[PDB]
């Protein structure tokens, strides 16, 4: 059952996973529309849809984390790291950011999201609003971990395990796949937050100048800069498979070491590294699962850390194809090549030199343990002229270049609502009519950018939904959709010189 | 009707407007009675009052107006039209083909500058006709505006008219001797409104997408937008220029073209036709009983001056680059701004050109100069060679421990400590009736700027700031290096809209 997995008695009992899904078929769309390719992930017992045990998916999801991936040989890994290090040195400076205050890290914790495996409930449950600080059990828990970290004792890299309840593509549901959610211990998140938050900030402020695109505003001149940067290279757009489960511990350890060089030395930094770089321990019920490979989605700064991992990987891959054709590589990989990454989602715009051997770059990449494909699950990965990133398709429009949100991602928001957990996606959903309205006004503003043929498809669907759900929409008017989108845009720029 | 006046072609305006503002607002800081090592500037000559200089008020209004009589050689029509097509089609690719709808009367009115002169046919600032919450305007002004709006909606365009004055600022001493003050053209509010209704939507489209178009107007030099500019220079040979006397070397035919380019990106409508009609017309500047018509140039103070100016600059550099190529018998197939990298803020610019273009760049300059322009050589020492040190809008792009920054010119910084604005007066010497609150803000900022240069040379500005704070009886929190740094950082991180709002 749990046997043949690095499983052990945790000495606690954390409780089972939630049953059901928060997803309801809409009141206006009781029956599966043709073209719908997504449906809630499999939720165990109670969907007459498939016969899966929840705990089955868990263990299945967990198999990758059960042993390590090949990684990158330590000598090559080290060269790669100097490319990743020197490059970002040059855009965020050699400055070392001072660590955060206990109160400072605290108010940055996401209040809507679990305290992890040592304290039940969400973080928000223990926040005193009048005092503007955490209180009670959770407070005690943080204080002590904070205390031990100042003494150079690291916190435990522990997670409350669960499955993401979300919309997934149908084939993947049929297959019995579902994604893992690693709810990290509030203490560890705090320690990590205090250490790297200033570094992460600098990287985000500068996006997309650094291959670490986290927090990129896809609906601003930020996107235009990104698009612009692909000019005069061979474009490859990728979306690796199961990225997080394919990460190598020694690479994550390198990334953390890089993040570390931009933070000023402090016990808190040391424990942040010690913690996030040792094996993950996911709890469920009375047992824990100690990972032997992989990065848990839901570790602090997983997106930032993932992207630096990605830089490392791709730099190593390029440095290795040049070596086995006995050509030297002249300068910085991120100067010569142009890279944009967000976790396993990326765009590589490489120089003719590189592009010519791009075949062994992939061979090197897969050999490390990664699975590259082919955004547009395009079954075979080629150069392209159509940039695709974070489910957007860069497109010229009457307003200039826009990142078009994948139409399925848009339309699906009309057929399903996120609401109250239940075993019956066909039951009446309890929902906030005010908020649903806004949600769909957003969707329309987004569809507007697709041009009036595909917008009409959406308006049609929208009008019908608005009726069925008893909502009045505005952006159901095409001129309306455009202007709201545009205000978002203008929007994501700060004008006249500030000082 | 048309008589002379110390060399000036001028004509009775009918209406009186009265003379322009008496005196200067600049006093020399009580902590700095004696001139300081490397002080370059001082307040503009202002005549009536000024015991320093023996120029009159109406003397140097002539020295400012002098150029605008002699029209400039300009760009020959055939080159012009071609250069236009390069400019137009390039800004199409980064702002799209869409046509922006004209502003409604109230949006138009809302953006009219409230601190500012009323034009030459209406009295007082625009504020002396506005009441907070009643939505609109009142008085003679509301009438003036309302007519122009209907006359303009029926194709009858307003008048390209201005109330001439004299920009009171600190200018180089060498220039202040040569009788020079810079002119200020206060614009008839009615005209400033019609243009607004026509173009604000386009100007915004350009600004919001900065610096991806060589129209830098609006750029936040203290944000990532600067870092982008900096990257866009890598790979070219870099020339930095700030052109001498830009506004008065502008060519009516160039200006006209720019405006049609602007028009291309607005939906066609009487309001638009009108603004173009007015703005390409010769400008005339009323000062009391007389007025002066321009036979060439640009009034510094026409609505959208910087935007239009910068589109002008695109045309000039494109035409001159494309001319150079012709005279070397080398084909030039691409669009100018995809091949070369340009940034312009009216007069000041940075050219990052490809090697081929660099090798014939002398002759580029020769072309520009031949259209009646006067290029220098931004960094005070000219020629006028390729640099590695980007300079633009008083900023030198420099690697720092916090990544690249546009460092404010130090002499631009330390100067703020030696002088202060306040009350109109005949002296820059006498004790001022100034506002400690505003002054304190200004210096704190100056410090926040100086901190980007690093500790050694920041400390010299601290030195200055201490001594300044004593003579002036102030307290300056950014006298601490970390505070200045913190307040800079505040600005800079606050210049980038993150966790995907949309």
UniProtKB/Swiss-Prot annotation, chain B:
Catalytic reaction list: RNA(n) + a ribonucleoside 5'-triphosphate = RNA(n+1) + diphosphate; Endopeptidase with a preference for cleavage when the P1 position is occupied by Glu-|-Xaa and the P1' position is occupied by Gly-|-Yaa
All residue ranges annotated as the RdRp catalytic domain in the record: 236-361
Taxonomic superkingdom: Viruses
Domain notes: Protease-polymerase is composed of two domains displaying two different catalytic activity. These activities may act independently.
Function: Protease-polymerase p76 processes the polyprotein: Pro-Pol is first released by autocleavage, then all other proteins are cleaved. Cleaves host translation initiation factor eIF4G1, eIF4G2 and PABP1 thereby inducing a shutdown of host protein synthesis. This shutdown may not prevent viral mRNA from being translated since viral Vpg replaces the cap. It is also an RNA-directed RNA polymerase which replicates genomic and antigenomic viral RNA by recognizing specific signals. Also transcribes a subgenomic mRNA by initiating RNA synthesis internally on antigenomic RNA.
Record-given protein name: Protease-polymerase p70
Organism, as annotated: Sapporo virus (strain Human/United Kingdom/Manchester/1993)
Lineage, uppermost ranks: Viruses, Riboviria, Orthornavirae, Pisuviricota, Pisoniviricetes
Shown segment, full-protein numbering: 1207 to 1708 of 2280
